[PDB]
């Protein structure tokens, strides 16, 4: 029934329940990439040590994502969908990253300074130390591959230089600038190292995922990886709830997983990761 599904898709709506009051300030207009794309105020990231007196000051277009599909007693991982490579917000990004003690970044997008800077670089160059707001970041090397590079950067506060920190930026440079990759393998491998990594740093912060405007690529990237740990944590012979999963994600930041395509790359990436995980196991 047309209405049986409409009054079903209605309860799936939360944008009306959750307020996006902070991203709406005429003070954060430039702090945004898409006027329609904004972070829920509740699960949104608040730049810290700022000044309440300054209209727009502690705002960043990002949110805290959490897999509510796994238990707190089940060491599930932490992410941060977010907007990305916006020149007009690079120090906001490093304050977000610094204050959230994040060690691994997951840029699901290349550079697109197009004429100006749709997507601009927020790192230096190998052996290059750059300052960003109160923090200085140095590039210790990009360990590329055919699809995703990997720059080793150490971020330290201009105040404390002996307080060195190395964050792992896993940029993905093979995503269809106008679609979804024809193969999960890459990101499926991309997610592999990222996971093993974060897991290497005993007490690191959430995983800062993002693209231009952390929504489509960012949403897909989170749900696939999220789904990977449910299996990795619960099992292959466990029930997967992609639809229920993607929603749980949306209800945390609007826009996560925007198109139909990204909707399939997940069915592909998870049907593959599964049959390949059991293949390895020689699951007959």
């Amino acid at each position: 029934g047309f209405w049986e599904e409409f009054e079903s898709l209605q309860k799936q709506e939360v944008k009306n329940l959750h307020q996006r009051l902070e991203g709406q300030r005429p003070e954060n207009k430039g702090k945004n990439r898409y006027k329609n794309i904004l972070p829920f105020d509740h699960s949104r990231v608040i730049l810290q040590g700022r000044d309440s007196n300054i209209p727009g000051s502690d705002y960043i277009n990002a949110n805290y994502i959490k897999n509510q599909l796994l238990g707190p007693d089940e060491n599930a991982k932490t992410y941060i969908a977010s907007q990305g490579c916006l020149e007009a917000t690079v120090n906001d990004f490093w304050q977000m990253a610094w204050q959230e003690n994040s060690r691994v970044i997951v840029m699901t997008t290349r550079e697109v300074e197009k004429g100006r800077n749709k997507c601009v670089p927020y790192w230096p160059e190998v052996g290059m130390q750059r300052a960003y707001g109160p923090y200085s970041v140095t590039n210790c090397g990009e360990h590329d591959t055919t699809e995703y590079k990997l720059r080793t950067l150490q971020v330290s506060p201009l105040d404390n230089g002996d307080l060195i920190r190395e964050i792992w930026h896993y940029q993905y440079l093979s995503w269809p600038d106008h679609g979804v990759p024809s193969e999960p393998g890459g990101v499926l491998s991309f997610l592999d190292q990222i996971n093993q990594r974060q897991e290497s740093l005993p007490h690191a912060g959430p995983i800062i995922v993002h693209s231009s405007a952390g929504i489509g690529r960012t949403g897909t990237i989170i749900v696939i990886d999220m789904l990977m740990e449910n299996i990795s944590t619960k099992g292959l012979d466990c029930d997967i709830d992609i639809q229920k999963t993607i929603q749980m994600v949306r209800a945390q930041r609007s826009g996560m997983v925007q198109t139909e395509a990204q909707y399939k790359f997940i069915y592909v990436a998870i049907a593959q990761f599964i049959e390949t995980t059991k293949k390895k196991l020689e699951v007959l």
């Binding site: 944008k15 990439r33 794309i37 800077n117 749709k118």
Partner: peptide
Amino acid sequence: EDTLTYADLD
């Protein structure tokens, strides 16, 4: 003029 396009959500 920092142009663009994109967004839609939930």
